[PDB]
Amino acid sequence: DIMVPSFVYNKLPVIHFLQEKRAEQKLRRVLDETYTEWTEELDQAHVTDAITRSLNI
């Protein structure tokens, strides 16, 4: 009735703060893993050059 409730009450703030920090850490890790991917595709100039070779020009 008295002791355990008082100690739980004393615990509450630190746990709340630590859990808030943990959530912010999760969000930060989520953000840090985002990178914009740039893909390289075969230049069409080579395709045009090959077309010329097929044209036998």
Binding site: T48, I51, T52, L55, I57
Partner: protein
Amino acid sequence: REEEGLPGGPVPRINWPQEYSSFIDREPVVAKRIRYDTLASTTLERDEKQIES
């Protein structure tokens, strides 16, 4: 270019009367005329619907 009927293929800025006169033996320059003329008589375009597909 297709509303004036102008030839699709690209055309270099050349004066063959000068090229004929500039060179020594005809065969090299003679061959040059064939390539560019052949190039100018073709349309270098593709069906982008299939390419996109």
